Amino acid sequence: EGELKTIMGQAKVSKLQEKMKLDPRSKITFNDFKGIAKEVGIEEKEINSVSNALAQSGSIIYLPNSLNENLKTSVFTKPAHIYQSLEHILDI
Amino acid sequence: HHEGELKTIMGQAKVSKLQEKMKLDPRSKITFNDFKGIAKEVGIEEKEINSVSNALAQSGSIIYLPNSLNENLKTSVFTKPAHIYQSLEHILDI
Incomplete structure (x- = not known):
């Protein structure tokens, strides 16, 4: 709602990055990503939204x-690097 | 989306280039109009800009x-x- 709450919520996802x-x-793993996110104050309730x-x-x-199986949990x-490599090998 | 791994990745690649x-x-x-311009330069259509900006x-x-x-924040x-995140935490000690 208010600008400060918005910015400060966003700051956590910047610290995640x-x-x-x-x-x-x-x-x-997603489980490990969950844990790094918790470290910067992002709760498990918000993790699906932040990952999307x-x-x-x-x-x-x-x-x-x-x-x-590899991709589903990773x-x-x-x-x-993946984007660049894909465009190169597929000649996009 | 099931089975759209390649389609997902390459759509994401556009937004990565925008960053x-x-x-x-x-x-x-x-301004938001300048931002729209930059996004279109990497091939993001007008129709997806609001979802990309979100x-x-x-x-x-x-x-x-x-x-x-x-008014200034609304269109910027x-x-x-x-730098803004860090400064805000600094000056308000939060």
Whole structure:
């Protein structure tokens, strides 16, 4: 509702992005992503909404509906390389 | 979406390039119309801009407050909001 609450809620998701940049892993379980998010004050009640906003923003790749077991539970935290590689090998 | 992994990823790649453009742009505050222009430069249609701008705000990549009553905030996009987050926590100690 109010501007400050909005900005401060958003700041947590920015700190989430910061932590994922510094983590050396590029692929983590959703359970691990949940835990990093908790570290910056994002509760489990908000995690589905935050993951959907990060996926639509292009900031993570997360494919919970995939039939592949690997992809279904995995969060790609540095997707930029994946986007670039895909456009190159498929010549988009 | 079941079975749309490749379609999902490449649609996301457009918004990723939009965040790239905004990191490289030296401006830290632009109008929403300028933002729309930049998004269309990476191939994001007018029809998806409101959903893209919502996902970017919720992920903390922009500040965009269309419901504000301050006319300037209402039509402005903050493209490097990390400095604002940090400053706000600093000056209000929260």
